[PDB]
Design a protein around this ligand. Sequence first.
Ligand SMILES: [Ca+2]
Ligand SMILES: [Ca+2]
Ligand SMILES: [Ca+2]
Lengths: 292, 292, 292, 292
Amino acid sequence: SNELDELASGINRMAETLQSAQEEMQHNIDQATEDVRQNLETIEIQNIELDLARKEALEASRIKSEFLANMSHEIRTPLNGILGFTNLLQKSELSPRQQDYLTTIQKSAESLLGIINEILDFSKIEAGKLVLENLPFNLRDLIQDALTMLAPAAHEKQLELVSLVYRDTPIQLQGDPQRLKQILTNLVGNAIKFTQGGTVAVRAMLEDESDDRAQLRISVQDTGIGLSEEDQQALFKAFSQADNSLSRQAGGTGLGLVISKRLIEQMGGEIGVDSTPGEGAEFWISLSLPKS
Amino acid sequence: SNELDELASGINRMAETLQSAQEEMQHNIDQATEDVRQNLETIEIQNIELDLARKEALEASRIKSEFLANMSHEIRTPLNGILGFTNLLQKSELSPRQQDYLTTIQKSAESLLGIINEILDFSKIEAGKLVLENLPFNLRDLIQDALTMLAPAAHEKQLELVSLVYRDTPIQLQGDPQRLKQILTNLVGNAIKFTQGGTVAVRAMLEDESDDRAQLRISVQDTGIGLSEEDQQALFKAFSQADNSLSRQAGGTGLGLVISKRLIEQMGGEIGVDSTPGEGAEFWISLSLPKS
Amino acid sequence: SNELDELASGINRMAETLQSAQEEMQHNIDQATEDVRQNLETIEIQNIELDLARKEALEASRIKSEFLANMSHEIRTPLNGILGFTNLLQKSELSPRQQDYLTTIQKSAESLLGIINEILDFSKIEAGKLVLENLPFNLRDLIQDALTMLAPAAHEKQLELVSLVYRDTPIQLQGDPQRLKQILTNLVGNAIKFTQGGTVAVRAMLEDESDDRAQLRISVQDTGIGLSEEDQQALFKAFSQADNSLSRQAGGTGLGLVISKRLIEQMGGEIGVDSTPGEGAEFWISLSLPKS
Amino acid sequence: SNELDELASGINRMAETLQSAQEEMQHNIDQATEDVRQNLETIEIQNIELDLARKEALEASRIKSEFLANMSHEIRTPLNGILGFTNLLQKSELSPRQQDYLTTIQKSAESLLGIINEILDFSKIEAGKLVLENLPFNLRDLIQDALTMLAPAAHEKQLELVSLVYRDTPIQLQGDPQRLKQILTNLVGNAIKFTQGGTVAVRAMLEDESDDRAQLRISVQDTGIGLSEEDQQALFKAFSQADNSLSRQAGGTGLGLVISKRLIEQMGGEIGVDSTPGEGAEFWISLSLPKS
Ligand SMILES: [Ca+2]
Ligand SMILES: [Ca+2]
Ligand SMILES: [Ca+2]
């Protein structure tokens, strides 16, 4: 019976390895109930921290907007007193020299007013409460008026201001002509600061056109003809600093550039800075506007 | 009988049920590899969003601080032109009426200067770059000097400025006497605006005392003696608005109050507003300062 | 997860060891079908040899019985001629010496006749064709009649024949009185040859008793009173030779003793030889017989 | 977690079916240890009965041989007395008629002596103690001498004894001439008893021949010429009875025929009886013997 005891002990050896493998497989089931518990614990712990950080960022944006509006109002009170009493003095008997000093106080106070209006504008954009007007306008007239406003500053630095609206450019549009002019004056004004000589050229071009709307590109370029190597380096450095401030949005190149980006984005457009070594650098805006 | 064929067919019947159970158990293993993958995907997706929101909050605070400093600088340029040319006009031949208009433009511009100095101060506090001085000072002299500077504003509204430092109040302390004076002038200046008549009373009291430090409470109270029911309602309303702005911190009661709260908190102290119907309302600060 | 791939690969590793163990366990099942076949082959091979040896022993016994009966008949034919012509000569004119020679031939032929009658008796016993009579008998009378017929032979050797049936011995029995007398005359006749002097004593004793049957012991003892040491040695040697012939059954102590053992065994009894040095040796029979 | 509890309960349901299948498979292992035990118990029980029956058959043959030798001795004692006293009477003064009666008693006793000598011969053959001699002999002389010894018995019944050894029959052989003569005298002697008239013819023929040995056939035929229908029926009946006794081996046709068959078989030969209605019946022997 040498083979009969082998079958009786072989089945006991086979069943002993199955009880040892089931103890190893039960350890895997006991570890899967703990590993899944730890995962659904961290998904809900991290899910509540994401709701907290999301709520804190929305409150910091609401408070930033309120703070700026309150600061603008705090400055507006004494500024209105300066503007009011300057007008009263301007209507009185003064010498030509005394009137020159008042004209300077008036222009300084009017620029200060423009700054606190940008702070108020930015607080409204930050809150989403900025309403754009809906008025028909002439794009050629708009660019010419913005360039006439900046002609003293351009002639101060020995620069020429050139405007170019092409024949195929649709000029009878509809939107916010004062906010579009605010963007243009800021871009042209910045271009004047960035160059030592040459011409600042504004071009208005058509990109795409339909029966109801018109897609436009407006470029403010400092061509830099006759600029020395030092002035060429200074021009590209100034435009790259403005391109960095456009991405950063911290008011590095002035608050007007921050608002120019937020205004063009509200109109469903884009703003950027282009550059070519033997062509000079430029600002550009791309926007779609309906036709009159 | 025929027991050998029962063992040979019993093992085939047992192995047939294991192949059917392994098909059901393979479906559970194929579902556990997808359910665990979805969990470790969301734990790492949520973990990267928490790192992103943490980095975005730090950048929004750095940009808020830079924006305010740039805004302050932008206003300072035209403001100094107003201040400068107002001084030049004040040195010229003008009538008494013309000189009174200039004095008003000058006072308005000086208040505007104080506001943009606070904006610059707040941008330094917002960046954590505000360093407190370490100078010995006399607390009685400090409060008396702050009240002397606010005496014209208090006498303009027919109010009296009273100071009271008790005998047991330790006056020989050490810290930032200019920042503590900035808090006091703001609190007393706000108290002057909140009342139509009576006295603004400042009291300096000891709360707790040790060999090296002193815990103090300073209260700026509008007692409101002789105020009509309308002026009493207006006083409580003004102080409750200031208490709301203290909690909100959005510059509702002026930027000076926002700085007063941030400065007292930087010194390890507290600030609040107390009120009693037949006693008038007050501002209070609690702070600990070392002696000598 | 790291534990999910362990369950998917653990089931494949567990099933791989079952296919390897089933190959080893299939070798044990293939060996059990051969080891059981060899066992049921030898049980039927040995079972057919037991039927063959049983049939061969029955044929050897049938042939032995036929041979003895034929041997008896073969001798009877010439023996009857010797007996017939001896009688014819005895009825003729002969001298006293010639008549003594015939008397010797006659007695020799009569003893030869007695031998071939025992050979015929034994051939009937050997064939199982011996049917026992069923007659009531008196056991005391039976033993007395057997002893009367052996008194000449006992008195020839100077011996006494004694009989002893106890008071408690049931004498009214039923069976084969002629076959029981044949056993007794042979045992007493042999006892007469085995001793030189004394008495041959027959004792009939009860061993066990019921309402319908009686278990008896009959002993034929040569007491050996007055026997010399030489005659005592010769007596025990003669009885031990008869005890050997009883076990051997080869006719060593005569064919009569072979028939005595077969007859007592057919009656469901036993026969033996007992011995005690200072008591003489004896024959004994044990048998159960019903009562009249 | 609906699929996690399915894997934890599926492994418990799978292991429950394995414990139930192992209980059924353990019952098969517990039955195989009893079924194999019963088989090896009967193989050893039957193996010991085969050793017992084998030993009992060898002892029954040894005892049969001793019994026959003792039977022969038991008959020899009274027979020797008859022979002895018959010779003593034959040497005395008797009439011719008295001498004829003694001659008959003598011939009857001498035949009886021949029978008990055959019983002693058969007991030696039965014990395997019969050694065959190795002597050269003349087969023609052997048959002629056997026929000369049986001529008185043949002439008593008015029969003729004829011998015929062919020219191609090898007569110079080697073996046991006395045992071969014993077979021939018995066969011829039996043939004499089986017929009432005619000739008993012995023929010696060659069957097969080699350089060292010779295969022979010897026939003893009762031709039965001149036999009536009654004597022809009696002849075939006598020879068919002898043919039955040859197969049965019970001594039915005399012990001499039993010895004739055992002797021819010991020499590696055969013996039988042939018959043809119009030719008479015969005995035959076939045997191989070496030459010279
Ligand atoms: Ca370019
Ligand atoms: Ca009984
Ligand atoms: Ca005894």
